[PDB]
Amino acid sequence: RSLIVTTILEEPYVLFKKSDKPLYGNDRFEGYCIDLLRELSTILGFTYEIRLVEDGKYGAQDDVNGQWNGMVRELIDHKADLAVAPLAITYVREKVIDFSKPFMTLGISILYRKPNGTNPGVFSFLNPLSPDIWMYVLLACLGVSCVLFVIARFSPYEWYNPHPCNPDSDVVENNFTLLNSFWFGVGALMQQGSELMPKALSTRIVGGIWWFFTLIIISSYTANLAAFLTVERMESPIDSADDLAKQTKIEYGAVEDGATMTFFKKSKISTYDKMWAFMSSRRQSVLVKSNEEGIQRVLTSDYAFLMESTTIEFVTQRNCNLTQIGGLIDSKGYGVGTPMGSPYRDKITIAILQLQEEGKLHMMKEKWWRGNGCPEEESKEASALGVQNIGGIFIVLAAGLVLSVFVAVGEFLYKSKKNA
Amino acid sequence: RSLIVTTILEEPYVLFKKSDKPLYGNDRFEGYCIDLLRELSTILGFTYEIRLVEDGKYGAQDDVNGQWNGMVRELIDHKADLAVAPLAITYVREKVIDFSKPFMTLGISILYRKPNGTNPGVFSFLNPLSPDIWMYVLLACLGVSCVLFVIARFSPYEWYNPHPCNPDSDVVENNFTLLNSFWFGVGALMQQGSELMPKALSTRIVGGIWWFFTLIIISSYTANLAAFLTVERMESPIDSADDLAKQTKIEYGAVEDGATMTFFKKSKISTYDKMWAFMSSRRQSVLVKSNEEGIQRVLTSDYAFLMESTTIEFVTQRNCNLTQIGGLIDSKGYGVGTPMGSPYRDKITIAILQLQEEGKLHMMKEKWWRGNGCPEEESKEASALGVQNIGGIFIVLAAGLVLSVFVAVGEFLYKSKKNA
Amino acid sequence: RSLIVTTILEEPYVLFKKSDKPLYGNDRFEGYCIDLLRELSTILGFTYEIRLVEDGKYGAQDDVNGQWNGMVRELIDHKADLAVAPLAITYVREKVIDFSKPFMTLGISILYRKPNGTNPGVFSFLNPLSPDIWMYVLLACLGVSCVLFVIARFSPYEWYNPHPCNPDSDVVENNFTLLNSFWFGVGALMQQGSELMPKALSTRIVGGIWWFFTLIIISSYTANLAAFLTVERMESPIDSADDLAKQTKIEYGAVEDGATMTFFKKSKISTYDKMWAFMSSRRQSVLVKSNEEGIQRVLTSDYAFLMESTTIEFVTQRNCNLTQIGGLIDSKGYGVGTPMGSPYRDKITIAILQLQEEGKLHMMKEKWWRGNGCPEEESKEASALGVQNIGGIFIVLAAGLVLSVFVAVGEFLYKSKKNA
Amino acid sequence: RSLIVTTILEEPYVLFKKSDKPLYGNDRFEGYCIDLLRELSTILGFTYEIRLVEDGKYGAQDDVNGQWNGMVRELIDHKADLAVAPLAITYVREKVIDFSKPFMTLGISILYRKPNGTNPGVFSFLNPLSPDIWMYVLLACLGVSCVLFVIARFSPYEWYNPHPCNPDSDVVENNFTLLNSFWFGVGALMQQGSELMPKALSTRIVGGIWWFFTLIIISSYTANLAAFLTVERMESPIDSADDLAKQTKIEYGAVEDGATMTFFKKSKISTYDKMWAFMSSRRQSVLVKSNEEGIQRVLTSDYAFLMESTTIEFVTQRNCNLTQIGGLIDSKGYGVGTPMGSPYRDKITIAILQLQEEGKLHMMKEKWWRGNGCPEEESKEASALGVQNIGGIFIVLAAGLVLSVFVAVGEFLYKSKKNA
Ligand SMILES: CCCCCCCC/C=C/CCCCCCCC(=O)O[C@@H](COC(=O)CCCCCCCCCCCCCCC)COP(=O)([O-])OCC[N+](C)(C)C
Ligand SMILES: CCCCCCCC/C=C/CCCCCCCC(=O)O[C@@H](COC(=O)CCCCCCCCCCCCCCC)COP(=O)([O-])OCC[N+](C)(C)C
Ligand SMILES: CCCCCCCC/C=C/CCCCCCCC(=O)O[C@@H](COC(=O)CCCCCCCCCCCCCCC)COP(=O)([O-])OCC[N+](C)(C)C
Ligand SMILES: CCCCCCCC/C=C\CCCCCCCC(=O)O[C@@H](COC(=O)CCCCCCCCCCCCCCC)COP(=O)([O-])OCC[N+](C)(C)C
Ligand SMILES: CCCCCCCC/C=C\CCCCCCCC(=O)O[C@@H](COC(=O)CCCCCCCCCCCCCCC)COP(=O)([O-])OCC[N+](C)(C)C
Ligand SMILES: O=C1N=c2cc([N+](=O)[O-])c([N+](=O)[O-])cc2=NC1=O
Ligand SMILES: O=C1N=c2cc([N+](=O)[O-])c([N+](=O)[O-])cc2=NC1=O
Ligand SMILES: O=S1(=O)NCN(C2CC2)c2ccc(F)cc21
Ligand SMILES: O=S1(=O)NCN(C2CC2)c2ccc(F)cc21
Ligand SMILES: O=S1(=O)NCN(C2CC2)c2ccc(F)cc21
Ligand SMILES: O=S1(=O)NCN(C2CC2)c2ccc(F)cc21
Ligand SMILES: [Cl-]
Ligand code: NA
Ligand code: NA
Ligand code: NA
Ligand code: NA
Ligand code: NA
Ligand code: NA
Ligand code: NA
């Protein structure tokens, strides 16, 4: 006779086909556990009739009397022959029904939003000093160079002889004009000295204190840039639950009374009870009621959702903003459910192991869990200083070579007006 | 018998549950002393049946009537059978009731605000070299340039032809005068070369060694400042009670008529009687009325709040800018009270010693005192240095320009005196 | 009945105790499978009574006689009652014996030597700026000095009196030639000033902007190198199997006639058949005879050793220069064997699922696979930089001096051609 | 009658007095528990006779029949009245004897050798580059400057006119002698350019490649010095057992079957079972048999001994090379032992609490646990670069100013021989 396969609606598992023809005859279904059910029926002979569970439930000790609702009800009443579905092999179900041997391995892992292209700025060289320090240095270049001008006109020792070769006199000039006083201050600031040095002691205390001011500015730029660039290099993203146990800034998640939330209750691993101390205290904010609303709260907030790995690897392949941070915490499996007795327990256990040696259970997971190929990495590595973080010293370079053409035209016109 | 348990309302010892439907009846509230009273009752038979004390006190002997208040009046009149609460084992209570053997150990310790590092000074650029090094560099410039003035006069090759711009002969002049030798030493130190370069070989060895000296000093300033900025290490001004006995800048704090104030009043230790000489003099300048009023004055005023040490370990893990400085000053203990003739003294004394070696007094304390955790050991991208960090190079700049005006006037008078 | 348990000698599964007096009798040895066989026996009645297999094999079907070897011959002849050992659930064994439901989960993964950072290259000084930046600076020197040659000829104030050493007039000469403008740009870039300083205002804006450009580039080189040297971050050349399918420089490894070599022989995946195209061609060039011989060739030769994933997690925590690259390739499992007609299949299937949810399969694995820990995340005081780190500045120095001889000969010929 | 005080030999507890007079009459004893026994007898009236335990044992379940050897034998047989001794209040003893209430609080803490004055060298500035790099730079200053000399004599474009003021000829000189070629190479190396720049393209490629070599040397000195100085600042010493659980380099200790070794057996704190995994595996090396041999193994090896806090605070005050790293792990206490019944249980419990309010139990611990005042700190803080780590640039400074006097004498003599 044709077997009765009691299954449930899940994705990429048993689904509905997108079509319109109303008379189906168990051809309305599609998914991983329908492609698995064809290949079990192929090598074991049987015909089958896919009849969904009416309760829409997997299986649960009802704990007032224990009527075992769901797909384990259809098996324990012998109303069903198979339960080809994601029917997880757990302890309380193995006593009342006979599973097959696993066709799927999962655990508990963490969803998180994928870290993206950090933009520290095109003008991000300007960060190691405060925005008033860059102003107070520029107001000290305009301040010292005016004090250089006043002192070098007033001190009698700067008024040297511009032609000492001929030992005569009557021509006495400073090299410190107003234009050459800013060029000392700009020149001494940029660590590359100008063509003109102070000659009097009163101007050698201006120049000698503008040189010490300049050392502390350039050294505290280089040492605070070293402090910025080595902290963001020392900063590594979270890649574990041992990481999540420490940062209370990144928020945890689970499902209301699921297999994940049950695991963190009965836990003596001592990382995960601290992860349960987060949940019992901060409940009704960190404890969402479904798998789909847990994805949305990662996608809105800074939320780290604790899902099973078979539906983390499904959502991550369909949403390149999402990632899986770490490894398997638990270790569970999916098995074809059978009632107790059931000569098809061993026949499917042989049949699953035959499809694993041939490699079909990997080709059926790649057929349903790939979806789209992601935009690859966009070179997500870093730490070499490039155009995206030091590339705004090229705008300032280009804006200084355009302004100098505006003055070179302006000097050519003022010289031409001088000829008239 | 349910054995009525008198109990006061304290945190994190006896806290209301406050989650749902407000009707339980002796399941209304939770905490450390209620988890303790469970595993006493689990080993020793009975049920909880807490009967929270009407008068909100622990117990004290008013001398006007010689009567007891709080809980230890409810013990002696046998209208309570236990006192499972933070009831401290004091001498005057031990003569009246009998205590069990302690379930917590504590003393007197000090709250102080956690060190911050937002005011490092205004000469905090001067830190990466010790003040012995900043003086030895200043004595090296005076040392080298006095060697340069001696060598360059004595060396025959520093005396040259001071006009090759017209080939005439019989002219012998040196460039290294006294002012021109200190300007080489200052100029070579500030990484910006002066207009004077040595010529013979001997001043090129004084010149070349002073250049290698200078690279090692500037690179050690830049690389120790780059260590000071990425690794922030804050230091508190006090780390004990004798260090806090000396600081009159930091004012103290304790509850008026508490177990802490009675310790310093009755003390004979030279530190703890000097510490009473402060807070008896000031007296409502440094004496708050409760524990919560004193915690706020650590947060608002400066402060030094002398309180019990289990209440500090509670508050230090909720607030992350409150820290415990020093160790325990007194040594006291919380014991479960019981009436004078009571079998439950010894039976709980055995029971408290049973949960300890099994480890349950520690695991309850890990449950009810731990909190957020304060995980701020990962530094932010250090700081944009402002006028709070470099800061005092704008002070020494203006101090060097005011000094330059006073030399320019002095060179203006020394020339007009030469005209006379 | 003691129920004779056949068992093979493996690590860290079945290890001799070796501490004292050599006479116990089925208490001689310890491990993971013996801790497992305890808590199976603790729940299910019986005592251990291990009866270690004489023929040191697991079981294989020689086709010449169709007989079984190892343990799974000792199961089918009912001369053993359990097989508590790493007996892998294979298809041909499942048709012959019945397995329990898995107590470990594993697959195929890759050993590779942990990345080292002792050969960063010889041009590893060039890393703190990206190769786009090293080209844009070279195009900036060509860009600025071609602007300097245009502006300084056009600016009327760069043309001056080129001998104030004798006051004679009617002489108009510029210092910014073509060779003298690239020497300003190279000189100002290398932080060491050339003998040419601009004079007008327009070349002082080209000069002053190129000085501020240069401070930001040299300070960003020094501060990103100071991040690269204190935070060592090593990268492996391979992190998967398809990245290792491409690298012909890295040769593979697997046991001859193992469960891993049979996977790649029978595969149809485009990567895992390309990976078989390598190691079937080479064949005793990349095929070791055991697991221990293959681990040594990762340590001595380069290597890529494809083996099981629980043996990697054992070896990766003993050696701290062996690492696991990539994830699991196959998916298999270790199941407790039992004979074909056996009640102990289902009773241990319930029992393995009982220790899992209580957490005992994880806590046994934490006991027997963990080791030293490899705690080398704290860096040593970084490195004295040698000819392995800076290194290639002695190459570009000698390449710049050999190029200088070829220009000096070319200037010697261009002068002797001018004599003709 | 006179009570019988059964005590044991311990330090600073019950000892022998250093004298010679043989007829004592319980005046041969001295220590903390003898000064405590005087003050208990003072306020409770009784006279006492100190009679040591003959077994020399504290107390132990003999576990073949349980004869309770030691000081608990003298109490349970009523052969003793008091047990004024460090008789620790533990669970199994409280059932068979009656302790008093504690006169002493301890726990479990860690001995370690105190970190001392680190000598990184007086010449410790020389560390950021390898000792062959400092040689290869000094051989490249002697190598380039000889290539400068050969090219500047051979290139026809360096032979300029040393007096271009007069437009005549016949005097043509280089400024690149052999002496001025080393002064370029030394001058360009020290980031402070000399008075002489190259004039030909063949010498501007030598100078232009010696300037790029120099930038990478000074930047990789400053960035590797920043890497040295920020790693030893990021390196903090161990101050916990959470620290000791990670470093497998620092070796643990305990006593053979003591109260400390028993605590790490029965431990679920999950830091300390890893600390027991160190002990069971590495036994007979990390597990010494007495408290005195554990002190010696800290004092010889890098060993971290787990002792009680009352004898860590005794040894640390007598040996300034030893320290206590962390806090109390366990929490125990010392009580006066009494048999069951015993009207002196409550009388001493009142008497101990009276001596605690007056503060005598702190004055009796300071009398016996101080010993010597330690040499204070010798300023054990750090991280400001001082004379002990950069002070060898002052020897090289002083050795260059002495060598230059030797050349200044040598130039004065060669000039004097030139006059002849
Ligand atoms: C890259 C640079 C390295 C190499 C170059 C080194 C250059 C050599 C010169 C170095 C001079 C440095 C002064 C040494 C003072 C040491 C004492 C001290 O630490 O504290 C005192 C500093 O009080 C002051 O006066 C600081 C003044 C700084 C500049 C003074 C000379 C100006 C430079 C002249 C230019 C020509 C000099 C050349 C020769 C004449 C007291 O201040 P404080 O407030 O108590 O600070 C601590 C408290 N706080 C932080 C919490 C606020
Ligand atoms: C403080 C300094 C910053 C500011 C100053 C910057 C100065 C501006 C000049 C910058 C020139 C730098 C060249 C950059 C090349 C980029 C490509 C690359 O990264 O790899 C290539 C480098 O191969 C080479 O050839 C490197 C040669 C370096 C010096 C070349 C010019 C000489 C200096 C001219 C002096 C006058 C110049 C002035 C204008 C003429 C290939 O090598 P690789 O082996 O594949 O390396 C990776 C592999 N490995 C590490 C694992 C081994
Ligand atoms: C930013 C700077 C880079 C660029 C500048 C490069 C500078 C030039 C190259 C310099 C090479 C230096 C050689 C040292 C090699 C190490 C050997 C050694 O340690 O022996 C001795 C050190 O010996 C010295 O102290 C040497 C002092 C430096 C020489 C100064 C010359 C300046 C001019 C040069 C002009 C060029 C000459 C051309 C002339 C025409 C002993 O020291 P120690 O045993 O280690 O001390 C014990 C403590 N410790 C072990 C704990 C650490
Ligand atoms: C004549 C020139 C020789 C001088 C040499 C100098 C060498 C060493 C000199 C000083 C070092 C010794 C300092 C010891 C500590 C004293 C504390 C102190 O004064 O700090 C005070 C200021 O700090 C200063 O003002 C420092 C003086 C700077 C002017 C010197 C310029 C000389 C430049 C030489 C050029 C070379 C010329 C070359 C020659 C050819 C701090 O005061 P405050 O209370 O914290 O203020 C807070 C203000 N607030 C409220 C706004 C926040
Ligand atoms: C694979 C790499 C190629 C090399 C081949 C490998 C092997 C070599 C094989 C053969 C040797 C080839 C060398 C050329 C011929 C030798 C003689 C000579 O130079 O001729 C003449 C032209 O002089 C010049 O070429 C330079 C002067 C003009 C400037 C040109 C742009 C400068 C950029 C270049 C550097 C960019 C770096 C900086 C960029 C920021 C010499 O005349 P001059 O006296 O020098 O100039 C006259 C001005 N003066 C009269 C006022 C004084
Ligand atoms: O056996 C089960 N299988 C499940 C399978 C899935 N699944 O996603 O395939 C889910 N779930 O949707 O979270 C819950 C399950 N609960 C179960 O009890
Ligand atoms: O009750 C005890 N008291 C002890 C006191 C001490 N003590 O040092 O005073 C020691 N000990 O010497 O390690 C061991 C002890 N063991 C005990 O069981
Ligand atoms: O629930 S099971 O059928 N038996 C228990 N386990 C594990 C021991 C890890 C596993 C591990 C992976 C599976 F696919 C199934 C199971
Ligand atoms: O009030 S007690 O029961 N007896 C006196 N003492 C101390 C001697 C320190 C201590 C010390 C710690 C406690 F927990 C209890 C007490
Ligand atoms: O050999 S099995 O018992 N059945 C087949 N499989 C897999 C489907 C992957 C797995 C996967 C993990 C196991 F632990 C066991 C098995
Ligand atoms: O062995 S006891 O008499 N009772 C148990 N405890 C502690 C709860 C920490 C303590 C703590 C400190 C003591 F001094 C005595 C004891
Ligand atoms: Cl008691
Ligand atoms: Na079953
Ligand atoms: Na310069
Ligand atoms: Na750094
Ligand atoms: Na009493
Ligand atoms: Na079978
Ligand atoms: Na730096
Ligand atoms: Na007792």
Q: Is D308 helix (H, G, I), strand (E, B) or coil?
A: strand
**A100 Cα: distance to centroid of ligand 8 (angstroms):** 12
CA distance A201 to chain B (A): 7
Dihedral over Cα of B171, B174, B180, B186: its sign:
positive
How many other CB atoms sit within 10 Å of the CB of residue C370? 14
Instruction: Count CB pairs under 8 A between chains B and D.
Output: 195
Nearest to D98 by CA among D106, D87, D107, D111: D87
Residue C362's H or E segment, with its range, is helix C360-368
The C-alpha atoms of residue D243 and residue D239 are separated, in whole angstroms, by 7
- ∠ Cα C170 C174 C179 (to 5°): 150
Q: Where are the alpha helices (DSSP H) in A155-246?
A: 179-189, 201-234, 241-244
The C-alpha atoms of residue C402 and residue C396 are separated, in whole angstroms, by 10
Mutate to test the pocket of ligand 5, among C414, C415, C418 (most ligand atoms within 8 A of CB): C414
Domains D3-105+333-369 and D124-235 share a fold: no
The C-alpha atoms of residue C203 and residue C208 are separated, in whole angstroms, by 8
Going along A328-393, which residue ranges are E strands? 332-334, 337-338
The C-alpha atoms of residue A172 and residue D184 are separated, in whole angstroms, by 34
Residue B202 backbone phi and psi in degrees, to 5: -75, -35
**C94 Cα: distance to centroid of ligand 17 (angstroms):** 5
Q: Is B86 in the pocket of ligand 9 (CB under 6 A)?
A: no
Q: Do C411 and D157 touch (CB under 8 A)?
A: yes
Dihedral over Cα of D336, D341, D344, D345: its sign:
positive
Resolution (A): 3.2
Measured between beta carbons, the chain C residues lying within 8 angstroms of D138 are none
**D261 Cα: distance to centroid of ligand 19 (angstroms):** 25
Q: Do C214 and A190 touch (CB under 8 A)?
A: yes
The C-alpha atoms of residue D355 and residue D335 are separated, in whole angstroms, by 14
Q: Is D305 helix (H, G, I), strand (E, B) or coil?
A: strand
Which residues sit opposite D334 in a β-bridge? D88, D104
Helix axis angle, A201-234 to B202-230, nearest 10°: 40
Q: Which residues contact C167 (CB under 8 A, 6 or more apart)?
A: A163, A166
The C-alpha atoms of residue D378 and residue A265 are separated, in whole angstroms, by 52
| Residue C410, token pair as written in the block | 């070319």
D410, D413, D417, D420: CA torsion to nearest 10: 160
Q: Do C156 and A397 touch (CB under 8 A)?
A: no
The C-alpha atoms of residue B19 and residue B23 are separated, in whole angstroms, by 11
Q: Do A397 and C129 touch (CB under 8 A)?
A: no
Instruction: Count CB pairs under 8 A between chains A and C.
Output: 205
First to last CA, chain C: 116
Contact status, residue A98 vs residue A342, Cβ threshold 8 Å: yes
Q: Out of 3.40.190.10, 3.40.50.2020, 3.40.50.300, 3.40.50.620, select the CATH number for domain A3-106+332-369.
A: 3.40.190.10
> May I ask the CATH architecture of the domain D3-105+333-369?
3-Layer(aba) Sandwich (3.40)
- CATH code of the region A124-235: 1.10.287.70
Elucidation method: cryo-EM
Q: Where are the alpha helices (DSSP H) in D235-359?
A: 241-244, 259-265, 274-281, 291-300, 309-315, 344-357
- CATH code of the region B118-231: 1.10.287
Domain spanning B15-106+333-368: CATH 3.40.30.10: no
How many other CB atoms sit within 10 Å of the CB of residue A171? 11
Mutate to test the pocket of ligand 9, among B106, B331, B345 (most ligand atoms within 8 A of CB): B331
D234 touches chain A (CB under 8 A): no
- D195 marked ligand binding residue: no
Helix axis angle, D133-154 to D179-189, nearest 10°: 130
The C-alpha atoms of residue A38 and residue A44 are separated, in whole angstroms, by 10
C165 touches chain B (CB under 8 A): yes
Q: Of D195, D350, D385, which has the smallest distance from its Cβ to B133's Cβ? A: D385
Nearest to B7 by CA among B40, B39, B29: B29
Class of the CATH domain delimited by D110-115+237-324: alpha beta
Domain spanning C15-105+334-368: CATH 3.40.190.10: yes
Contact status, residue D336 vs residue D83, Cβ threshold 8 Å: yes
What lines the ligand 11 site, CB under 6 Å? B 101-105, 352-353, 356, 361; D 89, 102, 105, 331-333
Going along B195-330, which residue ranges are E strands? 254-255, 287-288, 305-308, 322-325
C172 touches chain A (CB under 8 A): no
How many other CB atoms sit within 10 Å of the CB of residue B116? 9
Residue of A nearest to B17 (CA): A281
Q: Is C145 in the pocket of ligand 5 (CB under 6 A)?
A: yes
The owner of tokens 């998916």 is: C331
Mutate to test the pocket of ligand 6, among A6, A7, A9, A10 (most ligand atoms within 8 A of CB): A10
**C27 Cα: distance to centroid of ligand 8 (angstroms):** 28
The C-alpha atoms of residue C304 and residue C239 are separated, in whole angstroms, by 11
CB environment B248-264: b (16+ within 10 A), e (fewer): eeebbbbbeebbbbebb
Measured between beta carbons, the chain A residues lying within 8 angstroms of D193 are none
Nearest to D192 by CA among B191, B302, B419: B191
C318 touches chain D (CB under 8 A): no
Distances (CA, A) of D407 to B202, B210, D399: 6, 16, 13
Interface test with A, best of C44, C90, C123, C136 (most A CBs within 10 A): C136
Q: Which residues contact D234 (CB under 8 A, 6 or more apart)?
A: B231
Nearest to D159 by CA among D146, D172, D148, D178: D172
Class of the CATH domain delimited by C109-117+235-330: alpha beta
Distances (CA, A) of B219 to A64, A219, A222, B212: 77, 9, 11, 11
The C-alpha atoms of residue D135 and residue C217 are separated, in whole angstroms, by 28
How many other CB atoms sit within 10 Å of the CB of residue D237? 10
- D254 marked ligand binding residue: no
Distances (CA, A) of B97 to A106, B78, C139: 60, 11, 91
Q: Is B338 helix (H, G, I), strand (E, B) or coil?
A: strand
Known binding residues of A are 86, 88, 93, 259-260, 308
Q: In one letter, which amino acid is A364? A: M
**Would you kindly state where each structural domain of chain D is located, as residue ranges?**
3-105+333-369, 110-115+237-324, 124-235
Dihedral over Cα of D205, D206, D211, D217: its sign:
positive
Interface test with C, best of A87, A89, A101, A347 (most C CBs within 10 A): A101
Q: What Rg value do the Cα atoms of chain D yield, rounded? A: 38
